[PDB]
Design a protein around this ligand. Structure first.
Ligand SMILES: O=c1ccn([C@@H]2O[C@H](COP(=O)(O)O)[C@@H](O)[C@H]2O)c(=O)[nH]1
Lengths: 115, 112
């Protein structure tokens, strides 16, 4: 089972259902099960990386691709007033799934500080 | 149009610089929202993430790798939050794309 057995690894392999927005060879975008904004989705690599603090230098293009796919999906979902992208790292970040992912939140005014 | 982050990149006004290379700059946020709060910005003037090009992919990823290395160097061993704001709903404050890195306290949910 390539990609590991976190819930996101299993979503990648279609073993657990998700509401998928976009998929390519490098990543997957799907709606968050506990949305914190009217639109709230995740962009995740298909390659398993546990957290950003252990990403390798050669992962740069992949991490950037998450953001490019994030902004394209946001446009496709009509978030024309904007949105916020978030990565939660470790305990102080509140990370709860150790498979790297980018949150994209919009459809309402986001506030400052960002948590 | 130029921004205050352009002035910072050009060293025209001061900032507490953490790291620099040929394509990005990391510096402490002047209005910190956590005990550690810094920015990583590209030297290329991309005004907002919504207009970033496909060719910008590795540059954007570079901001994140530089961010995580700076976070480690600044002792954020318990973790942190990375943020990119887009547009008015995103609360984007400067139209030069920038990665926020916040830590040194528990970050909360929702993220604004
Ligand atoms: O089956 C799952 C499990 C988690 N999540 C979402 O993944 C995120 C995990 O938390 P964090 O690691 O991003 O803090 C949360 O927003 C949570 O709702 C899902 O969408 N589906």
């Amino acid at each position: 089972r390539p990609g590991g057995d976190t819930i996101f690894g299993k979503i990648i392999r279609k073993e657990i259902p998700a509401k998928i927005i976009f998929e390519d060879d490098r990543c997957l975008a799907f709606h968050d099960i506990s949305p914190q904004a009217p639109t709230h989705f995740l962009v995740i690599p298909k390659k398993h990386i546990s957290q950003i603090s252990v990403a390798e230098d050669d992962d740069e293009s992949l991490l950037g691709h998450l953001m490019i796919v994030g902004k394209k999906c946001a446009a496709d979902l009509g978030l024309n007033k904007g949105y916020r992208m978030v990565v939660n790292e470790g305990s102080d970040g509140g990370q709860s799934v150790y498979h790297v992912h980018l949150h994209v939140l919009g459809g309402r005014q986001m506030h400052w500080p960002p948590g």
